[PDB]
Structure formats: structure tokens, C-alpha cells
Amino acid sequence: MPTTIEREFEELDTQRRWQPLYLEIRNESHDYPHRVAKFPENRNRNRYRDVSPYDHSRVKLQNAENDYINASLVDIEEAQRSYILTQGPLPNTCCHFWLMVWQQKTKAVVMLNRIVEKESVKCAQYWPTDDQEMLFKETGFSVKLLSEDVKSYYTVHLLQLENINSGETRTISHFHYTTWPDFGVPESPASFLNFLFKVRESGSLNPDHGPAVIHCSAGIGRSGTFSLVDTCLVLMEKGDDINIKQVLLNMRKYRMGLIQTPDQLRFSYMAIIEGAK
Ligand SMILES: CC(C)CCN[C@@H]1CCc2cc(O)c(N3CC(=O)NS3(=O)=O)c(F)c2C1
């Protein structure tokens, strides 16, 4: 029979209620303090003045003079899942990004943007593209490209993250979705689901590892879409119904503006429907 989410989707589609439902979410999302992001010392650590992590859920850099990073811990207790959603690193925050990855014991970095989108740099080149070692002297980290697996719409880079201070190294999986435009959607629910199931298959979203770092340019539109679909598919496993609107409103309490367009909200519904099959 048509599932409850399938009927909710059919109702929104035939009644053309996507733009009003998105506006409902926007007006029902409560604002939370983000005073630390706005400190004058952190102005050069933010990529967008209107995108800030909340004080109650920001990720702190441990043992640092300035513990600030534009990253949020998004916890979904019910789904047994936590992520770090962050902006695409700036040239001066690449060292903080790698320090965060180490401290949080992250195993995978999920990248949903391209470095250059619509005539603008949306992210720094924070990982090496060749055999040259990329050095982050501020925090004491090295990154070396170990291998690259190129697919039509995504690439997986294996990276060696060296902590020079401790002499330890770790293998990080860098899942780069290369065909998801800024403020746009992936070309199909199947391509997004195949990429999502590749990240899951690696164990990087499990509780035996630290939270996976999900980023696009601002860390809210495409990262929000990816995270909602993944969380809703886990909540779906208990045979219950999910109020997608409420799960998104709950996620928006950890990081502001998750899902930036009504078409990204519609895509989240199609992907959750096809995923649960
Ligand atoms: C929190 C909210 C009120 C701020 C709303 N203004 C900011 C303006 C700058 C900006 C730039 C982006 O590239 C994007 N992305 C769109 C997408 O699909 N993924 S993304 O996060 O990289 C933004 F969402 C925003 C939103």
C-alpha cells in the first residue's frame, strides 16, 4: 500500500505545497545564541557572516588559545547518530579543520561541494591532489593522498593524516560528491543513495568511530539535506512513521538553516522514500 510518507509526498506534490511547507519550517525554527562566533577575534574564521554555529552545540578545538571553529555537533539521540556539520575550510582555517578531525576521532570527511561554484571559491583546497605532502604547521598536521577512486558523480580519496606532535597517523576516507550544485539537488535520488550507502558501508557513521564531518560551502544546505536523509532512514528502521518536518526542526536546533531551498526539502522526501525500499 502507499506508505504514510508516500501519501504525504503525493499530497504536497499535487497540492503544490513545497514552498509554503519550507516557509513553515523557516518560521517555526527557533534562534539560539551564537555569541562566540560573533567575537571580533573570530571574524576571519567565518566564511559567511549569516552562517554561525550555536554556542550550545559548537565544536571546540581542545588545548587551543582560540577554541573556535565554524562547526556544529548535530546529535540525533533517537537515531543513535551524531555528525559534525561545518563550513568548507578557509585558507586560514584548514589547520583547525584537521585538528578537529583528529580530536574528534573522525574516520570520514563527506564533502558535498566543488572547490569552484558559479564563479566563486566555495572551499579551500585542504587536501593534496598529487604526491606532495600538505603541511599545516599551525596545528602540527600533515596530509598525504594515498589513493583516489573516481566515479561519474563522486570520488573517494584515501588520506593519511599525520599528527606530527604525537608521531601517529590515521587513514581518513574523503567522500567527495562532485555533482551537487550550490543551492541545487543531486541529479537523482539513486545517485545520492548510492553515495550515502558508500559512506555507511565504510563504518564511518557508526558509534565505534568519532562523528563524521559533513561539509558543503556554508555547511547547512547540502550538508543539511545529506544529514536529514541519513537520520530519517535510521529512524525509519523501527517501522514507525517520521514527521520529516519535526526531525528537520529538531536538527535545526544544532545548526541554523539546515536545507536551504524547498526543492532540497522535496529531494529529501524522494530520497527517504526510495531509501526505505
Ligand atoms: C542560516 C541562514 C539564515 C543563512 C542564509 N545565508 C547563507 C548565504 C551564503 C550561503 C552560501 C552557500 O553556498 C550556501 N549553500 C547552499 C547549499 O545548497 N549548500 S551550502 O550550505 O553550501 C548557503 F546555504 C548559504 C546561506
Residue numbers in the entry: 1 to 277
Recite the paper's sentences.
PTPN2 and PTPN1 have highly homologous active sites; therefore we designed molecules that optimized interactions in both PTPN2 and PTPN1 through structure-based drug design. Subsequently, partial saturation of the naphthyl core to obtain the corresponding amino-tetralin and optimization of the amine side chain led to the discovery of AC484. The crystal structure of the PTPN2 protein with AC484 confirmed the formation of several crucial interactions in the active site Cys216 region. The highly acidic thiadiazolidinone dioxide moiety made up to nine interactions with residues in this region, including hydrogen bonds with the Cys216, Arg222, Asp182, Ser217 and Ile220 residues. We additionally sought interactions proximal to the tetralin ring and designed the isopentyl-amine group to further engage in a hydrogen bond with Asp50 and a hydrophobic interaction with Met256. Owing to the high homology in the active sites, corresponding interactions were also observed in a crystal of AC484 with PTPN1 (data not shown), which resulted in low nanomolar biochemical potency for both PTPN2 (IC50 of 1.8 nM) and PTPN1 (IC50 of 2.5 nM). AC484 is a zwitterionic compound (NH of thiadiazolidinone dioxide pKa = 0.9; amine NH pKa = 10), and this feature proved pivotal for its observed properties, including the distinct combination of low plasma protein binding (86% fraction unbound in mouse plasma and 50% in human plasma) and low clearance. The combination of optimized properties and ligand–target interactions of AC484 drove low nanomolar enzymatic potency and significantly improved cellular potency (STAT1 IC50 of 176 nM in B16 cells). Additionally, in a biochemical phosphatase screen, AC484 demonstrated high selectivity for PTPN2/N1, with 6–8-fold weaker activity on PTPN9 and no detectable activity on SHP-1 or SHP-2.
The phosphatase PTPN2 (also known as TC-PTP) and its paralogue PTPN1 (also known as PTP-1B) are negative regulators of several cytokine signalling pathways and T cell receptor (TCR) signalling and therefore act as crucial checkpoints of inflammation. PTPN2 and PTPN1 (PTPN2/N1) dampen inflammation by dephosphorylating members of the JAK and STAT families, positioning them as negative regulators of signalling through interferon (IFN), interleukin-2 (IL-2), IL-15 and others. PTPN2 also targets proximal TCR signalling molecules such as FYN and LCK, thereby dampening antigen sensitivity in T cells. Here we present the discovery and characterization of ABBV-CLS-484 (AC484), a first-in-class, orally bioavailable, potent PTPN2 and PTPN1 active-site inhibitor.
